[PDB]
Assembly symmetry: D2
Homo-oligomer: 258 residues x 4
């Protein structure tokens, strides 16, 4: 089976990568970074996010695995001491997490998939966007920006913005505010909002039409944006899982104790 | 078809109730408060919560409707000006919202269903409960209490505790903290937590074993409690719906503007 | 000089107390728990709060010292390994922290001093109090309760309610909400509020007139309350200080790392 | 007495300005925008902030007044219907609010005064700054940025970041976080922090040394910054006051009702 390994690029991750390639060479495993069926990411969650986006156009053909060469990751949830054990196993069940579809319309159109979140922020100071939910005007937001998170993204930016942590088996997306203005003139809901599949959340400009839009680790200034549309994707990321490591335990282990 | 009408008991709600009974008398509708198939609640959301608990043992045989004789309710989402219009319609589709199952174990066992939420608070000062998720010890909570909310309950106590607002088509429950202590000795997650169906959240005492447990509007001091167990119920509440009034619009109308 | 020592009452604190009494016996120090000039509290901050209230009527005649026989306290900020060193020193400068004056009016009047905070909570469910600031109606609060904190109290209940941490050299008091209801009908400020000396914050009932009022570790159900009035006290608590242990370092040491 | 009038520049504010200049022409008042003793700002709080910075080098020689031609401002707290009444009065007591001193050190040095706040944000994504309080390392902050507010600034950016509202008679500054990361690896205090006069808060880079620093409405990318130092200024802004309009009432009027 074709596999590839991305590395964070520090000495520990590079050497672990080379040692795992050696191990795979002892099985019927072919290294192929063009059409892998298995993508192993060695590093932390940033490395894992890069692996996802490197292969996002072949997501249904790939099972991802993450090895953390520092602290426990939510994606990189395997320790380097089990690298040799993991090679033997690869040569399993699959677990799928929901993804966020982001559409950017100009005046053509571009789509992006997010594993953690997509955000929109101002070209300086506070910006103003109308928030439309299923074609219904919900609020006029004035403030620093907005963050739309996947379930597995809820432990990342979403959490620091006060959002809820959502088990990734729930097919949903969660919208959180960054520093909204609320006075007698300006009003937002304030609370995070959790949307099911097939709900569409549209952000539309009011005066300024330039924004910084991020998708996971990738931030891009978009000019002449007419709309940013969020919906739970029909596409899913698949993990190879070899043991039970429950999400709520990953949460406990990362934020409570370990 | 058998129906009954509960009233808030003020002059406006009582008279509306009597006028609707008169209207129903002009159709093949029988007033029956023992085995109604239709339960109309005239008042506000507190009246609607009482109607739900009055008939909670026959939930699958009943379609509920709420009329608000004050401001818009999330359950009582019909205006008194449409009472006559509603009688004609009753004589429709059904919409179902998830419910919260609460189990209280002593040392027998009692179960309760919640439409908004169930909370646990101390017999004075801060109390200490261990929080166990699917048999896995997640945190030791020290503070004022904990709130487990349904989706439609997320706009109620849950919202004032910083929880996310969740569309009620999502079969989930949401746990929020009330004033947790966090220092070098005590640690909680802080964030609201959203659980899917078939996850079980167990609260267990540490020293003191007496607690105040609420279910919707009903608060009861429970002695010698060993455990409080939360799970999304298999039971659902059914609404009679006659027009589109989207949840996100009810949110906008109650918290943003109207 | 007359001194006394309170103990948490566990084996470690009792023995440390007896060993310090022995040390003081080697100097011109007289043990006197009726009219001490020095009050040493051995335990944690709860013990220190009890010492303060045991001698609150002679506050200007007393310098307090706290020894923590567990983790670092904000009041009990001396380690047991320096007990012998502390005896020699006692036989120094003084540092003073502001206090909170609480007045409870019925229909006579009672005053209390708080070192951490005074709170008001409901006789069940949410309660409703009008909040009047310098005789000006500021808001109608509906929710779980309100907390008025001193500066040194800001790291305690106030912090868990989202309040700011305030250096205790600032003569002020800070008001924080517990779970307020905010919808189209009910409105509060939400933010913590910080008041200088000579500002008076009055809480007044709306319907129910029974409340639970706490002052530091002491919680008391007050019947037929007409008003609870908060102001920065003219009285101050005095600490004996023998070394520099800055407040911001105590904060770092308790909440960040140590 | 020399005065000048700034205008928001819309039709309503320009005409009010011209009408007030006419009124002043009937008294011994000389229009002088180089050395005014009275500075009237007609617009909203943004106009008032611009007036402050236009004359910040002569603050002790000037009494400011703000007229709001839209909704009530915290600085622009006079209605256009009292413009004629205000001219007669000008031809009073003075009220002074504290200011924030910001020092930017490179590798020379630049100082700025803020009426609302000074913030520091990243040249993209999260940035990392060490926070040093009175030469004591307090925390390593990773996240979107930090906001240091004056008392009268607490109702502005500070409030949207969860900070406390502080009466402006308190000589203090308040530090609030923007979206900090908190996991097993990264730790911040989370709570807003309130500092008295003569405390110095230093922000220092860790890797990246470029930042966006704002002072009130003015945002400037600073290259090769070694340190940003915050302290309560010795300088104060002086308002001409002609009637009692208490701060807590301005708060009520802007955020609760009017
Ligand atoms: C390229 C860098 C900037 N990373 C990689 C990652 C990750 C990431 N994934 C997750 C996740 N699923 N669950 C829990 N933690 C996560 N991590 C951690 O996040 C910290 C910062 O990377 C590290 O501990 C990561 O291991 C990008 C992510 O940074 C988040 N981000 C940006 N700005 C933030 C802010 N101000 N506050 C909080 N988060 C912020 C956001 O999700 C963005 O995608
Ligand atoms: C018997 C009384 C006390 N009610 C009836 C109701 C309702 C209720 N349902 C909802 C809902 N689905 N969504 C949005 N709003 C709701 N309302 C409103 O809630 C306010 C207070 O009743 C009123 O405007 C209600 O119309 C009980 C409910 O009170 C909530 N509660 C208790 N203590 C709270 C607090 N401190 N803060 C916020 N909420 C608190 C909680 O949900 C409990 O079930
Ligand atoms: C009798 C008991 C209940 N204690 C003693 C103390 C203290 C106390 N002083 C302080 C302080 N100056 N600064 C920082 N920490 C403090 N501690 C700590 O507080 C924790 C709980 O005692 C322990 O780690 C204490 O060492 C009473 C105090 O309990 C606070 N309290 C009550 N309910 C709370 C809640 N839900 N959340 C957060 N705090 C809550 C409140 O201040 C009350 O006075
Ligand atoms: C040039 C513009 C951007 N203004 C002018 C002003 C003011 C300002 N002063 C105050 C104040 N003393 N107290 C209460 N409100 C204030 N206003 C109001 O603030 C809103 C936005 O201007 C309007 O209603 C103002 O009348 C700059 C100020 O914008 C604040 N700011 C920036 N980004 C923010 C955000 N994300 N959230 C909340 N505030 C944010 C900040 O204080 C900055 O100085």
């Amino acid at each position: 089976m074709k596999y590839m390994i991305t590395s964070k690029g520090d000495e520990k991750s590079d050497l672990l990568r080379l040692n795992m390639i050696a191990g795979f060479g002892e099985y019927d495993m072919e290294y192929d970074d063009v059409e892998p069926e298995i993508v192993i990411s060695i590093g932390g969650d940033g490395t894992f996010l890069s692996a996802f986006h490197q292969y996002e156009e072949r997501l249904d053909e790939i099972a991802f695995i993450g090895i953390h060469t520092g602290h426990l990751g939510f994606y990189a949830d395997w320790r380097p001491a089990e690298a040799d054990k993991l090679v033997k196993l690869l040569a399993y069940q699959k677990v799928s997490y929901p993804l966020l579809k982001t559409t950017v319309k100009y005046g053509k159109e571009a789509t992006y998939l997010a594993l953690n979140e997509s955000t929109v922020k101002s070209s300086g100071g506070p910006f103003v966007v109308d928030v439309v939910i299923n074609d219904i005007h919900f609020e006029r937001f004035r403030g620093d920006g907005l963050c739309m998170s996947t379930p597995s993204g809820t432990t990342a930016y979403n959490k620091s913005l006060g959002g809820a942590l959502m088990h990734p088996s729930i097919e949903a997306m969660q919208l959180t505010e960054m520093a909204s203005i609320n006075n007698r003139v300006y009003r937002t809901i304030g609370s995070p909002l959790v949307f099911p599949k097939h709900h569409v959340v549209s952000l539309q400009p009011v005066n300024d039409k330039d924004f910084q839009i991020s998708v996971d680790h990738l931030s891009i200034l978009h000019r002449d944006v007419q709309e940013i549309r969020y919906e739970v994707s029909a596409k899913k990321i698949h993990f190879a899982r070899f043991r039970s490591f429950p999400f709520w335990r990953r949460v406990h282990d990362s934020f409570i104790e370990d």
